[PDB]
Design a protein around this ligand. Structure first.
Ligand code: AMP
Ligand code: AMP
Ligand code: MG
Ligand code: MG
Lengths: 414, 414
């Protein structure tokens, strides 16, 4: 009773449709990187909160016009000025300083010439204003940039450094955001040893757990390492129950081929009572990829049972798991970014859509990047930042050639 | 004595030329994300370490040809088989299982038909092999993938999840890598309050420290928050000395305009005895950007004194600081990725090269992304992932138009 071959498109939209959006929590704004706001954010103050000089120069009365002026003082950053500027007077200003009462324009220092300074040269006393200021010129009025009561960030915003800066600006230091998913990862197989182990007969080292944990951590999500679980139903069930208790998402690898001692799909259905939405996907690599949900007490747990083959495990993790995690953490459109790139060599198409890690590189002034499939010196050292997404062959199209434009999913920093 | 206007190109190559590469340390391979290897890494074992089946099926003698065979047992994942396959016999195998002595090919289960099983149906006893196996078919010989003594990762490799997986595979759990830079960030100005503060007259909240710390943290580097420092030389000097003691890199903002009570450049030169390599850059925004080095006891400290304007501070941090940090952490080519994109609206060029945060988006099947400068509903919510890099105007070129292809530095995940 093998599972139906699910099309890639159906498998992907099934993952997104079935994956929940996690609840919310309040965080400190400094912890906001990558978080999605679950509230609108409003300014409680004006920016600037005082009329502010745009320039180093002098606060003047525009109606005085050009001419020679007594400097009555300086408006300093961080100090509300005392003095009122009267006709024939000016006050020195620096960028960002408050404009004193009496002044209605700023003349930048380049449009002036100093007439008199103190004997020790530390204080300016008289200045020539060379231009006719326009009223308001080189002043940021109160609220020019942000007004009190303005919504400055909308719920749904996926925050980066500039948004954290905006929170700092408006003094909203605690915000409601969606939670991040906690992702538990286990490996399965009697043949597996820990990375720390010397080899024993018949055995290999577990690489998927490391690769998958690192992939998830690269996207900023907390992880739980559930170790290596042997090929038997009791141990698998116990490990899955641990994952369910400790995490929002359980990723397994291995144990999902058709054939002997691959028990995971049985355990998920009969013992765990999960709903397996697909158990095979028409894709290369990744045929045995399995996706299940488990609803407990009005909470939906997500389970990805990925293929054991290490290349398949990392490919399917990027295709299916990462977008699910993005939806769980509140990203409204959780689809991965897909770009167009030129194939760096000929490739044979399969009846299945096929996927392969690659390196994306821009060449001098050429508008499209090149995609070089993994496996020169320097290029063979590059870490993969793309996943080639090649179409199924048709009776028409059987091969794609060097230079032809293909889809590439971004999986690494470009 | 204002500093010369340094060209953008000179300022950038000066930063890279003058920035040191940090020393090395040994880390656990699980901590390797984003690290650069400072050693070659060799395999001490073969992969696979035993001849391994590619398929679920049967290990056979190819010389037997097709026909009916007694199944003498199963080769299980994780177990070295006991039995030798003799003429007329086969052993069941699963993918990854060791090939028993006596067998020289694997026939996949689809090319067989089962003849007899145990009464309870749990054990296969006799099978029909329908095909003539080629010797070696569907077996991964010892060392097929990785050979003992093979260099699997070269020094200089910038590691991602797949490299961490490869370390796990070959059991090299501790590796030499370049250190990451520790980056101290301070804000300057008597007008600044903490994000947590209510406003007071003449004051604003410090946003640059948050924005800069978040920018640095986004790239994975450890940070130190040095707070707000007032506009006076003693306090500035003390804060810089603290930064120097605690960190590899000091980022300040503010205090770098020409004019009153901007003391930082004096303090760096006269009090700290640093070498200021440039104090102005012909760029928009970012004119007062300052870069200095300080050599203490054969250690080179890096100091970036960025403009106080928040937009300028974040722009110059991405242009100058991030590439320096990349060089410090051992990345051989620390240049940011620059892509080609289409302008989403007309823009006026300046005599200075100009830079602006933007959002990069791909449109259905169009090969080039569009770049929309920051400042629709949904687009106005996007976090910036690009920095537009617009050329200086010429007597020829004065304006660029919607749809024209421009350079964009990637600063966010695409
Ligand atoms: N964690 C792992 N690390 C490396 N190889 C694995 C891992 N899990 C499974 N494999 C291999 O991938 C193949 C498929 O495993 P399975 O899906 O359990 O049949 C077999 O060759 C396994 O030995
Ligand atoms: N940390 C900061 N956060 C927000 N605005 C700042 C910050 N530092 C400086 N500014 C403003 O940027 C402008 C330039 O400051 P400065 O370079 O100190 O003259 C002035 O308007 C300052 O008030
Ligand atoms: Mg297995
Ligand atoms: Mg200042």
């Amino acid at each position: 009773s093998p599972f139906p071959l699910t099309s890639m498109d159906k498998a992907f939209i099934t993952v997104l449709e079935m994956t929940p959006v996690l609840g919310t929590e309040i965080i400190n704004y400094r912890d906001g990187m990558g978080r999605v706001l679950a509230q609108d954010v409003y300014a409680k103050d004006n920016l600037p909160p005082f009329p502010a000089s745009v320039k180093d120069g002098y606060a003047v009365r525009a109606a005085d016009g050009p001419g020679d002026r007594f400097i009555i003082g300086e408006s300093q950053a961080g100090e509300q000025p005392t003095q009122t500027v009267m006709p024939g007077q000016v006050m020195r200003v620096t960028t960002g300083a408050p404009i004193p009462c009496g002044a209605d324009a700023v003349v930048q220092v380049e449009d002036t010439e100093l007439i008199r300074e103190s004997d020790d040269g530390t204080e300016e006393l008289e200045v020539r204003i060379l231009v006719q200021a326009r009223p308001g010129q080189d002043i940021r009025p109160i609220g020019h940039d942000i007004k009190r009561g303005e919504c400055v960030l909308a719920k749904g915003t996926h925050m980066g450094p500039s948004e954290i800066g905006l929170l700092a600006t408006v003094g909203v230091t605690e915000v409601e955001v969606n939670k991040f998913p906690v992702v538990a990862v286990m490996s399965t197989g009697n043949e597996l040893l820990n990375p720390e182990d010397d080899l024993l007969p018949g055995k290999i080292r577990d690489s998927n757990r490391s690769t998958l944990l690192a992939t998830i951590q690269e996207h900023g999500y907390p992880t739980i390492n559930l170790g290596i679980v042997g090929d038997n139903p009791d141990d698998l069930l116990n490990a899955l129950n641990e994952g369910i208790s400790r995490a929002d998402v359980i990723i397994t690898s291995g144990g999902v081929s058709m054939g002997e001692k691959d028990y995971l799909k049985q355990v998920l259905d009969i013992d765990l009572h999960a709903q397996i939405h697909f158990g095979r996907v028409f894709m290369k690599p990744g045929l045995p990829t399995t996706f299940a949900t488990l609803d407990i007490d009005g909470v939906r747990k997500i389970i990805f049972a990925l293929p054991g083959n290490p290349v398949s495990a990392v490919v399917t993790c990027n295709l299916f798991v990462v977008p699910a995690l993005r939806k769980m953490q509140g990203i409204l459109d959780p689809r991965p970014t897909i770009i167009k790139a030129r194939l760096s060599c000929d490739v044979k198409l399969d009846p299945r859509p096929e996927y392969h890690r690659c390196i994306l590189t821009w060449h001098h002034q050429e508008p499209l990047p090149w995609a070089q499939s993994t496996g020169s010196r320097l290029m063979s050292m590059r870490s993969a930042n793309g996943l080639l997404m090649l179409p199924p062959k048709t009776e028409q199209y059987v091969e794609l050639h060097k230079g032809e434009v293909v889809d590439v999913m971004v999986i690494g920093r470009l």
